[PDB]
Design a protein around this nucleic acid. Structure first.
Length: 92
DNA sequence: CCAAGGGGATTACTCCCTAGTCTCCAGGCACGTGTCACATATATACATCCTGTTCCAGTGCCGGACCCGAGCATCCGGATCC
């Protein structure tokens, strides 16, 4: 009895906690794209058509533009997910 | 080969008798050094005084060992691109 949920279960394809990606897919459904079960960052709502080597530098620019308080909140928040990632698998 | 006694001899202290020479034998002199004298100088037993360093405390500091945590890198977990 370390964790009774184990809903992903891995096998080569899963979703991280199935909730934060769901929390990101909710704006997908609410806004114009209304995508099938795929979930990503915010900038895709502005431009659904994106590509790697190009859809990441604006995130770094935004991080530079924002403040140290926001950066610290970012470092602090998801450590909850760091703690929770060991519950269901129970190990590595 | 020496100790005792055989006779025979010049010396050297000893008598005789005089006399002139260092030495006892005492009333007086003004000296010589062994003792005396007040303190010296000499060697010794106490009380532990007071100083300034030089004999030491408290903590008037915080030196090493072991487990964590900051941000930029690469693996991996995830968007979705032909």
């Amino acid at each position: 009895s370390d964790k009774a949920k184990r809903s992903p279960g891995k096998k080569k394809k899963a979703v991280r906690r199935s909730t934060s990606p769901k929390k990101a897919a909710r704006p997908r459904k609410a806004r114009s794209p209304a995508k099938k079960p795929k979930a990503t960052a915010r900038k895709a709502r502005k431009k659904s058509r994106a590509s790697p080597k190009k859809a990441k530098k604006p995130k770094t620019v935004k991080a530079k533009s924002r403040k140290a308080s926001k950066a610290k909140k970012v470092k602090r928040s998801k450590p909850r997910a760091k703690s929770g990632a060991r519950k269901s698998p129970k190990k590595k």
